[PDB]
Amino acid sequence: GADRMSKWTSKRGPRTFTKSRGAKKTGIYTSDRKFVQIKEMVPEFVVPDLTGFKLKPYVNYRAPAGIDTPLTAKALFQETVAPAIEKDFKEGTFDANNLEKYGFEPTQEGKLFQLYPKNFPR
Amino acid sequence: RARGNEYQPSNIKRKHKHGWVRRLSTPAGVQVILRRMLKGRKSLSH
Amino acid sequence: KFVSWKSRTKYTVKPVKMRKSGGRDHTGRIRVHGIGGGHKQNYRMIDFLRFRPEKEKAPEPFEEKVVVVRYDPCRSADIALVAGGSRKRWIIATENMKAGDTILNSNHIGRMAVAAQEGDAHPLGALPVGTLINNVESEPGRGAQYIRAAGTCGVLLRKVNGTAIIQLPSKRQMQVLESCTATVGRVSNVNHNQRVIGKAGRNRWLGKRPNSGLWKIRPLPPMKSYV
Amino acid sequence: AYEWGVRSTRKPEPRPLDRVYEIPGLEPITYEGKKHFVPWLARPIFPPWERGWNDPRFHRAAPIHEQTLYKEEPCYIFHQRCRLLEGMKQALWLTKTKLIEGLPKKVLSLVDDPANHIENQEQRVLDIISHARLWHSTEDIPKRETYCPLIVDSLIQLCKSQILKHPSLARRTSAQNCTLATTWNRESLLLQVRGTSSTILSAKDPLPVIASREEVEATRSHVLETFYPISPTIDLQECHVYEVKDDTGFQEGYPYPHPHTLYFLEKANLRPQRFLPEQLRAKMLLFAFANALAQARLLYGNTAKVLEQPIVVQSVGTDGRVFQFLVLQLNTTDLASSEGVKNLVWTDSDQLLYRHFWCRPVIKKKVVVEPVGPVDFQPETFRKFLALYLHGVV
RNA sequence: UCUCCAGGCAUACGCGUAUAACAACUCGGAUAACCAUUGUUAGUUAAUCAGAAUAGGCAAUAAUCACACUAUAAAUCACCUAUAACUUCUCUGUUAACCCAACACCGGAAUGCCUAAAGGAAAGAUCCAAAAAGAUAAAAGGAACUCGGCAAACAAGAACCCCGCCUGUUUACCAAAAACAUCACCUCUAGCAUUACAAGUAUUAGAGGCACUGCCUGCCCAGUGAUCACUUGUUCCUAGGGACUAUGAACGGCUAAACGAGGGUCCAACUGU
RNA sequence: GAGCUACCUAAAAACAAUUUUAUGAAUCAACUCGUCUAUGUGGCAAAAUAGUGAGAAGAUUUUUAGGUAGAGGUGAAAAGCCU
Ligand SMILES: [Mg+2]
Ligand SMILES: [Mg+2]
Ligand SMILES: [Mg+2]
Ligand SMILES: [Mg+2]
Ligand SMILES: [Mg+2]
Ligand SMILES: [Mg+2]
Ligand SMILES: [Mg+2]
Ligand SMILES: [Mg+2]
Ligand SMILES: [Mg+2]
Ligand SMILES: [Mg+2]
Ligand SMILES: [Mg+2]
Ligand SMILES: [Mg+2]
Ligand SMILES: [Mg+2]
Ligand SMILES: [Mg+2]
Ligand SMILES: [Mg+2]
Ligand SMILES: [Mg+2]
Ligand SMILES: [Mg+2]
Ligand SMILES: [Mg+2]
Ligand SMILES: [Mg+2]
Ligand SMILES: [Mg+2]
Ligand SMILES: [Mg+2]
Ligand SMILES: [Mg+2]
Ligand SMILES: [Mg+2]
Ligand SMILES: [Mg+2]
Ligand SMILES: [Mg+2]
Ligand SMILES: [Mg+2]
Ligand SMILES: [Mg+2]
Ligand SMILES: [Mg+2]
Ligand SMILES: [Mg+2]
Ligand SMILES: [Mg+2]
Ligand SMILES: [Mg+2]
Ligand SMILES: [Mg+2]
Ligand SMILES: [Mg+2]
């Protein structure tokens, strides 16, 4: 006589049954049955200053949309890294060991924001 | 006495007797799940 | 899913909570009939190696003081808390033990017979022939396994070389090494057999369920006709 | 010898190692690279894992022998829950004290004086008993864990009202849940007491000495009784990791340096969890003696000697109906030997404040056999209680 | 407003929007009104109600107003020693006339408080037939009824036979009993430990039978001369020669009472049988 | 498949009043059961209703979770019970 198709949520079942609705934890339950909220675990909204900002929600219908060109690794590399290496190659002051000079990161460990595995939310 | 009321609902009993974890505990139960997947059942277990 | 309650590794005088079986096994099927319910009971860990010298002590005869003679739910006989040194341990109590009495536990094998005082533990070699004993142990250092029920006494029939013949309460004669330890006297509750249950309900208190309601020589061919 | 713990309940023995490991020079192929178990590959052997930093939530303690305060010599600790098998006789031996029945004559004479008698004394005590047992709560029958603290606290407040007659009583104050501790030696045994008091009453002046120097010297003839085969340390905690400490309940500089009375409460609801009168007295003596000895060491240092100025401390213990009164005089700090000047303790035991209380009238065939109140109230017990409180003031 | 009825309010488990308003009047309620129905919009708000660091040492002393007592079936972390940490409120439950019975089912359904201050309506309208069901009353009589005093009664008292000792248990849905169990008694099996029996040990445990109690009967235990001699008996060596003997079964008649929705019987009363 | 039922394990709960030699005692509710009769017989009900009855501090009743599965389990044996 039970309903098999509806979702299992905390509203159903006995009182002992409990489960979350998808909210991220903001603290720890210590011994003695005490909740201890952690300030670092609570997301902080980084909101910029919008004074003097010229961009608004919509755009002029007369504004031309551009040709779609999704960014690629090569496109990023040419814009940022290529000029430095090309200039250094002409001067001859280039070596394999010092790729970090141009912006290469040997490892993501020690960075606050790691690209892989990602350690920051959107 | 009057019959027909043999179902005495209890969610703890229902999930323990027929739930996901119960079915995967034995190979016979896993095969139960495989059969229901092959048929296309929307509900594989309680 | 059945886990035995006998999971305590360290000896203590604190009573231990017992789980009942009902006659089932770890499989969950009845293996013995007539077992169910009863009064809730607590287990008091008995020490059946009377001569257990205390930790960090020499193996020489020592004495212990009888604190109290209690009633045991788990046994026909009654138990006595006995104290010596800094150690307390439950033991089986003999016929005449009282609180405040002193009992000896001796390793010494007397070359001559040792006077028999009820409650003291001596090697069977020390005892003289004919002395009633209880809590006998088949093998030296094993621990008492026989004659530990209420009122049961075993006679020491004979001693030859390093072996003695012990007549068990069933009159079955047994032999053991004279190094084995026995306790003098008969076990307590000498009148346990005189008890009258009186009513059916009293047995159900003791964890006993009622019996079921259900209610072969083959002749040889020469005798088959004449059966 | 029977071994405790059936094998089925023990931790299962490790499964045997894969035979590929036995072969020398061969590197087994395991499921380590997969990062999950598979039944058909060899089981990896992992080196012990170190987090690389300390996580308080998952701290792991070092073994006993690695603790800094680990010491070869055992120290037997007496604490609240210890129940001495031999009762007072064991407590007398441990503390090297002589027992005299009855309270000191000076204390007894205080309440014989009519002036000390409180106005409406009997009625107020009866009201305290009724309030402690019945009126204080909304429930039909209060439990001992509530009224046992309440009865004593009410009595102290009743006795504390005598400041009208005696302004000196303003020089003493009370604290609650105070820790007391001492370490001393008895005949090659290192003994420590760790304890607390339900209430501690302390004064700004020392209590008068009860026994004269001649009486203290006369105790040398008295010999501490022995209880073979039971050892003095039975029911004590054998501790190998311990720190030697002395505690009087307060830090140095406390304006009330002299403790006056210690109160101990058997407030447990269940009988098996409640100390018996004999064992309560032993606990009172050891806890009171510890309080006295800690004070002695603070004043006179760590030396062992017979004290020129003895220390007097009082102890009261009750389960809410029975009261035990104890007076201790500390005469010596030379306790290592069992012979010489001995301490003196005066005890009045098993004093019934009231025999029984009926929270609800007893009715038999519509006849009120017993009224709803205290039964067989004994005012004598409170007079002893009042006498000890007034001691050292009047 | 009136007449009458007398299980209500909470929690648990369960149920899953049936909650509330509006709008509809197709379907659903076994009919209307009105909605429990359809559509749309809303709703249940908690730091107290409810759910969701480590290693050592260690315990004889029920509950019942716990005192006195008596009892037997023997009956609920703490505290201490060290180590580590050195200020916190997020998450989830909360509606209802509701659940299990295919139904808006005279059914089943735990606990706390209370017994009307809470909660409800037996009659859609009319008529006053037969038969059928239920309630009340009965002249004279009082079991003449009937298989049977079934049912009913202004009665609800007495007594005896049979069976079972008794309180219990059983064929859910045609048998509640004389059957089963039962204390007591008897027979058989077992001399022993780390998962049942049992952390037990012959006064124990298991298997099974059977009313107990007291009272009877008496299978039986070589003979003859007396602890003693010969004949037997059993073995061998060959009919001879040695070697060796060393209370109680089966049953019964009934403690003899008490008790019973057991099966028969009788008297008194009572009655529309 | 043991959310019914049979038995068991763990943790819990309920039992007013009245008498008694003090209890598997007595009277009688709540509660559990189901003696006898009538109704009902596609019923309110795939076993009920209405009366009348039995036990009602115990071998009592009841709640929650767990256990034993068909060549089997459970059974105070009715070859009864296991949706
Ligand atoms: Mg069905
Ligand atoms: Mg149920
Ligand atoms: Mg039978
Ligand atoms: Mg409307
Ligand atoms: Mg309609
Ligand atoms: Mg509505
Ligand atoms: Mg609607
Ligand atoms: Mg609500
Ligand atoms: Mg139906
Ligand atoms: Mg109303
Ligand atoms: Mg009508
Ligand atoms: Mg009539
Ligand atoms: Mg008539
Ligand atoms: Mg006739
Ligand atoms: Mg006729
Ligand atoms: Mg009739
Ligand atoms: Mg019967
Ligand atoms: Mg009966
Ligand atoms: Mg039945
Ligand atoms: Mg039937
Ligand atoms: Mg019947
Ligand atoms: Mg029937
Ligand atoms: Mg029978
Ligand atoms: Mg009957
Ligand atoms: Mg007649
Ligand atoms: Mg079940
Ligand atoms: Mg009652
Ligand atoms: Mg009865
Ligand atoms: Mg009755
Ligand atoms: Mg009756
Ligand atoms: Mg049954
Ligand atoms: Mg049969
Ligand atoms: Mg048959």
From Swiss-Prot, chain A:
Any single GO CC term annotated in Swiss-Prot or TrEMBL for this entry: mitochondrial inner membrane
A matching Pfam family: MRP-L27
Native source organism of the sequence: Mus musculus (Mouse)
Gene name per UniProt: Mrpl41
Lineage: Eukaryota, Metazoa, Chordata, Craniata, Vertebrata
UniProt keyword Ribonucleoprotein, yes or no: yes
Molecular function GO terms recorded: structural constituent of ribosome
Protein localization: Mitochondrion
Protein name: Large ribosomal subunit protein mL41
Function noted in UniProt: Component of the mitochondrial ribosome large subunit. Also involved in apoptosis and cell cycle. Enhances p53/TP53 stability, thereby contributing to p53/TP53-induced apoptosis in response to growth-inhibitory condition. Enhances p53/TP53 translocation to the mitochondria. Has the ability to arrest the cell cycle at the G1 phase, possibly by stabilizing the CDKN1A and CDKN1B (p27Kip1) proteins.
Keywords for this protein: Apoptosis, Cell cycle, Mitochondrion, Ribonucleoprotein, Ribosomal protein, Transit peptide
UniProt main location, coarse: mitochondrion
Keyword Plastid found: no
Subunit text: Component of the mitochondrial ribosome large subunit (39S) which comprises a 16S rRNA and about 50 distinct proteins. Interacts with BCL2.
Family to which this protein belongs: Belongs to the mitochondrion-specific ribosomal protein mL41 family.
Gene Ontology annotations of biological process type: apoptotic process; mitochondrial translation; translation
UniProtKB/Swiss-Prot annotation, chain B:
Residues modified to Phosphoserine: S25
Keyword terms: Mitochondrion, Phosphoprotein, Ribonucleoprotein, Ribosomal protein, Transit peptide
A cellular-component GO term for this protein: mitochondrion
Taxonomic superkingdom: Eukaryota
MF GO annotations: structural constituent of ribosome
Location in the cell: Mitochondrion
A GO biological process held by the record: translation
Subunit structure: Component of the mitochondrial ribosome large subunit (39S) which comprises a 16S rRNA and about 50 distinct proteins.
Family indicated by similarity: Belongs to the bacterial ribosomal protein bL34 family.
Protein's name in the database: Large ribosomal subunit protein bL34m
Coverage span on the entire protein: 47 to 92 of 92
Swiss-Prot record, chain C:
Domain of life: Eukaryota
Keyword annotations: Mitochondrion, Ribonucleoprotein, Ribosomal protein, Transit peptide
One BP term from GO: translation
Subcellular location: Mitochondrion
Molecular function terms, GO-annotated: structural constituent of ribosome
GO (cellular component) term, any one: mitochondrial large ribosomal subunit
Family: Belongs to the universal ribosomal protein uL2 family.
Assembly and oligomerization: Component of the mitochondrial ribosome large subunit (39S) which comprises a 16S rRNA and about 50 distinct proteins.
Protein name: Large ribosomal subunit protein uL2m
Species per Swiss-Prot/TrEMBL record: Mus musculus
Gene that encodes it: Mrpl2
Residues of the full protein shown: 62 to 297 of 306
Swiss-Prot record, chain D:
Subcellular location: Mitochondrion
GO annotation, cellular component aspect: mitochondrial inner membrane; mitochondrial large ribosomal subunit; mitochondrial ribosome; mitochondrion
GO BP terms: mitochondrial translation
GO molecular function terms noted in the UniProt entry: structural constituent of ribosome
Keyword terms of this UniProt record: Mitochondrion, Ribonucleoprotein, Ribosomal protein, Transit peptide
InterPro entries, per the entry: mtLSU_mL37 (IPR052482), Ribosomal_mL37/mL65 (IPR010793)
Coiled-coil stretches noted in the UniProt entry, renumbered to this chain: none
Signal peptide: none
KW Ribonucleoprotein (keyword) present: yes
Pfam families recorded: PDCD9
Keyword match Nucleotidyltransferase: no
Family as reported in the entry's similarity comment: Belongs to the mitochondrion-specific ribosomal protein mL37 family.
PANTHER family: LARGE RIBOSOMAL SUBUNIT PROTEIN ML37 (PTHR15889:SF2), MITOCHONDRIAL RIBOSOMAL PROTEIN L37 (PTHR15889)
SUBUNIT field: Component of the mitochondrial ribosome large subunit (39S) which comprises a 16S rRNA and about 50 distinct proteins.
Protein name: Large ribosomal subunit protein mL37
Annotated organism of origin: Mus musculus
